[PDB]
Design a binder for this molecule. Structure first.
Ligand SMILES: NC(=O)C[C@H]([NH3+])C(=O)OP(=O)(O)OC[C@H]1O[C@@H](n2cnc3c(N)ncnc32)[C@H](O)[C@@H]1O
Ligand SMILES: NC(=O)C[C@H]([NH3+])C(=O)OP(=O)(O)OC[C@H]1O[C@@H](n2cnc3c(N)ncnc32)[C@H](O)[C@@H]1O
Ligand SMILES: [Mg+2]
Ligand SMILES: [Mg+2]
Lengths: 434, 434
């Protein structure tokens, strides 16, 4: 490959040096007698100045016709100039047009288009600066998680996606034909992580999870990226400490590295800056009282839906925990509160500013008889869970874990109006394509 | 959480210090008047010495009954002793039996069991030392890949799993009902990575890929982990350089960190040590000649199946490339060799010692008309690929990429007898459970 110079490298200190740019036309404007092509690549935008008496009539005429997203190679000499973007421009000596484009279907400001058009052309939308900024934020949050997980001594595992058991209820399970049988798409790797702690003690995975959720909200995808941890020996309170340390590190590391991208989306970084341990903790009981005090018609035992969570977040300026939920609005695998068996040792972590749940976790039931009884009570077939019950037969230990919704976290960090914008190619009940 | 001391931390320098172990009984033997419990955790095995006159009759009797995989907490004093494992043992003061076990269904040497029994109890098999060693190797290879990818400036993305297009042929596609429509499970994220290079230039993903492969070989899973890279500007020769640099780094970093685990599986590390650039490169033409010279009944134009690849590997002592395949045994998206349009600019990387293909990659067709013609020739519906064709309409650039099978790589590194042992919970046509 003939090596290129990235746009971000075009700096005043390169004055007088030859560079080869490779990228796509961002804008094309005549300035005086010259053509100014702003060329974008994955690192920035550089002004390339095309002069007729330097490149010749043929090249000059070709340059006039280059619309947005035309692919080009540009060779020229860097000139330091304070008026130019980045303080330096390229005086073009050679222009190779790879493909001229004049009708790119995403507008220069994509948010002047209908969101439905942007989704119809999602494969083109992702190359635009704001959409790409979201993907850089997403990769940085995940990089940060892996740094924290490595340092704190967790083992990464690669759990199955094709499964035979519901983790989070049958209502949101995708079913498929699998040769001579049927399989489901995993809603969560949790049960497999619970198997893995017996060999590795502290484990995590990052997997796509699948939820056949009919409701078309701004917080639900049918496919999402799910960062899950499970640990031997830890109780609910221990796992909550892990959650706040991990999320704080993810957010602070991403503030450190991606300030520029975040400032494209936020006028106020306060809640992100506030994201350090210890996070506020309220009981579900306290949540109900806060909600009732603000006029919300909620009764103890009711689920906290998105609208309840929204009002609740008004009282907080950073992520916070709600803990100790009524048993029967939570999943079958959760350990009862030994002080009050009406409740389970569950906690959710909610983001402020209306975003609501980003993590769901719990301490797991570690008693065989109790777990089996709960499976039966929920109308589940113990045969589908025999292997999971085995974990309570062959050296059971107390353990806890949780799952983080990566897109939910990205949506809060960037104050997105819909979770879909945090997925490279979002999947929702009416959207499968591109 | 009351803090524990990991088995690996029990060292002679801790002589006289109190420790709290937490783990599972590995062996239980009476030695003289005492009970020696070897306790395993995720980091090793420590000898815990239980003396009747120290712990009392009740505890001593409980200790006698602890079989393999009994879960225990042990508090005691470290004593340096050269006869003990790791040069140090724990003199037990307190033993808490969490759950006594006597009938763990995996034998102490698992390979004395039928592989079918181990798979039936896969959730228990994964906690055993060899199986856990495979998972530590797998996580280290992947950690190494991410280190290399970060340093070399690639962006991580999170592509879709629910899709509408075959990347690697319709024969191995899983189909499912998706609300009012149908979806497929991704065979490969490649086409989406190709969209993403227009914004990010150099991208990668690690995703589960799904292949409805009926043939029950030792090299095929129906679900596998797929590390894929795609890069603007790079041709086939460029991407081959990336492949050998990445794989060499993965293997060398894993040799550095996981020598102990690898030596559980290999008597000879030579081929791993040999894995540094430049890898040998032979053309498909050369491969055919080598094969014909060794008596293999292969004709130019024929696919190189697993048995052909096996014989071919005999001539190599490290991974190697085969390049320049006949067009019609390769996928629709591959760029024709401009010097010889009977061929495409494809290469596979084969592991030695009979393992065969670990990477499939190519330069991609970047001309709209050629790609459309190929889609039509293969009986594919251009409507399902309109968005992919769009990438050749809106600023097309030359580009190349590849996919690495993580389990295939692990199987070669550890000289496994079947790829299934490299998956946490393997999926094959007859195996969906646990
Ligand atoms: N390992 C565990 O303990 C996780 C547990 N088994 C679990 O699946 O919990 P959830 O609360 O359903 O999901 C966990 C998180 O996953 C996200 N999530 C859950 N459903 C989601 C959906 N339909 N779309 C997008 N994100 C979704 C939310 O952030 C939620 O807090
Ligand atoms: N991004 C790309 O260019 C990849 C390309 N779209 C692709 O899917 O190529 P394959 O050669 O089919 O698969 C790539 C690798 O994926 C692995 N693989 C492919 N099929 C596999 C299977 N059924 N089981 C286990 N591993 C399998 C093999 O290592 C193979 O070399
Ligand atoms: Mg939840
Ligand atoms: Mg292949």
């Amino acid at each position: 490959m003939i090596e290129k110079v990235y746009c971000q490298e075009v700096k005043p200190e390169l004055d007088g040096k030859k560079v080869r740019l490779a990228g796509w036309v961002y804008t094309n404007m005549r300035v005086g007698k010259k053509i100014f092509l702003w060329i974008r690549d994955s690192t920035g935008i550089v002004q390339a100045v095309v002069a007729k008496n330097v490149v010749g009539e043929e090249t000059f005429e070709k340059a006039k016709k280059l619309g947005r997203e035309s692919s080009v190679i540009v060779e020229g000499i860097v000139k330091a100039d304070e008026r130019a973007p980045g303080g330096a421009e390229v005086h073009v000596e050679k222009l190779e047009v790879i493909q001229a484009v004049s009708e790119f279907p995403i507008p220069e400001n994509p948010e002047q288009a209908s969101p439905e058009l942007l989704l119809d052309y999602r494969h083109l939308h992702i190359r635009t600066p704001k959409a790409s900024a979201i993907m850089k934020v997403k990769e940085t949050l995940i990089m940060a998680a892996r740094e924290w997980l490595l340092k704190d001594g967790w083992h990464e595992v690669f759990p199955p996606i094709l499964v035979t058991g519901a983790v989070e209820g049958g209502a949101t399970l995708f079913k498929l034909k699998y040769f001579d049988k049927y399989a489901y798409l995993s809603q969560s790797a949790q049960l497999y992580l619970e198997a893995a702690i017996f060999g590795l003690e502290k484990v995590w995975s990052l997997t796509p999870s699948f939820r056949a959720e009919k409701s078309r909200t701004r917080r639900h995808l049918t496919e999402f990226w799910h960062l899950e941890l499970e640990a031997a020996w830890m109780d609910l309170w221990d796992i909550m400490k892990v959650e706040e340390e991990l999320v704080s590190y993810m957010v602070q590391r991403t503030l450190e590295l991606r300030k520029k991208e975040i400032e494209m989306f936020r006028d106020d970084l306060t809640t992100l800056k506030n994201t350090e341990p210890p996070f506020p903790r309220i009981s579900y009981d306290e949540a109900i009282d806060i909600l009732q005090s603000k006029g919300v018609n909620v009764e103890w035992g009711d689920d906290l839906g998105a609208d309840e969570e929204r009002v609740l977040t008004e009282e907080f300026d950073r992520p916070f925990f709600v803990y100790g939920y009524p048993k029967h609005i939570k999943a079958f695998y959760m350990k009862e509160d030994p002080n009050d068996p009406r409740k389970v040792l569950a906690s959710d972590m909610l983001a402020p500013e209306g975003y609501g749940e980003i993590i769901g976790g719990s301490q797991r039931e570690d008693d065989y008889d109790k777990l089996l009884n709960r499976i039966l009570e929920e109308g589940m077939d113990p045969k589908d869970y025999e292997w999971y019950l085995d974990l309570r037969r062959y050296g059971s230990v107390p353990h806890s874990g949780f799952g983080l919704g990566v897109e939910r976290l990205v949506a809060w960090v960037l104050k997105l109006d819909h979770i879909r914008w945090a997925a490279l190619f979002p999947r929702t009940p009416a959207r499968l394509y591109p």
